[PDB]
Amino acid sequence: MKLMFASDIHGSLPATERVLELFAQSGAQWLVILGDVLNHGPRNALPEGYAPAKVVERLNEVAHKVIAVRGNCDSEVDQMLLHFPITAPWQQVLLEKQRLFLTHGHLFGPENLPALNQNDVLVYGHTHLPVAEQRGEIFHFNPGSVSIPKGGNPASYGMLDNDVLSVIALNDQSIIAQVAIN
């Protein structure tokens, strides 16, 4: 199975178009969006090519292939525009060998862990920092941000391919971090 992950888009049209381009070329079946989709975010500058209404038209074109959770920056007006369900604060995704716990990062995350099974995967964003590692009995995965990178990391996205979780550079496409989840 092949899944693509994207998070903290914050209204950036160019980041969105590049994501949708890589999605189409990857062959992945679904696109998981971890929150903070249109709103740039009160405490920071507008991202490159900020254009909420256009990001909306682009994303709504693959709405039937999107799985998503509510970011701290997402609001009711956002759901009214996006043709896929974003209001759930968290959502589990059942895979053959394990579970994926999807959440933005502000309500649940590394500091407030959910009950899970050994080798399950905690998937979150919000921090804008890439992560692909084993933490205790479970795995932690954060695809970083596709628009507002932090900690010196390049804009990035995530990918699940053949039991391997990888954080990939949006432009470079070089592997930032990865871990096998067998």
Binding-site ranges for Zn ion (CB under 5 A): 8, 36, 71-72, 126
With CB under 8 A as the contact rule, the residue among 88, 112, 163, 180 that binds a copy of itself is: 88
Is the separation of the CB atoms in 11 and 47 below 8 Å?
A: yes
Size of site (CB under 8 A) for a copy of itself: 49
Told to check if 80 binds a copy of itself by CB under 8 A, we report yes
Is 83 annotated as a binding-site member?
no
The tokens describing 145, both together, are 């941000």
Told to check if 164 binds a copy of itself by CB under 8 A, we report no
With CB under 8 A as the contact rule, the residue among 108, 124, 139, 141 that binds a copy of itself is: 108
Question: Pseudo-torsion of CA 106, 36, 104, 66, nearest 10°?
Answer: 160
Among Zn ion, a copy of itself, none, residue 178 binds (CB under 5-8 Å by kind): none
SS (H, E, C) the chain: CEEEEECCCCCEHHHHHHHHHHHHHHCCCEEEECCCCCCCCCCCCCCCCECHHHHHHHHHHHHHHEEECCCCCCCHHHHHHCCCCCCCCEEEEECCCCEEEEECCCCCECCECCCCCCCCEEECCCCCCEEEEEECCEEEEEECCCCCCCCCCCCEEEEEECCEEEEEECCCCCEEEEEECC
Interaction mask 7-46, a copy of itself, x per CB under 8 A: ----x-----------------xx-------xx-xxx---
Site residues for a copy of itself, 129-158, by CB under 8 A, read none
State the nearest-atom distance from the C-beta of 65 to a copy of itself, in Å: 6
- Residues flagged as binding site for Mn(2+): 8, 10, 36, 72, 104, 126, 128
What residue ranges bind a copy of itself (CB under 8 A)? 1, 3, 11, 29-30, 38-39, 41-43, 52-53, 56, 63-67, 72-78, 80-81, 83-85, 87-97, 99, 106, 108, 114-117, 120
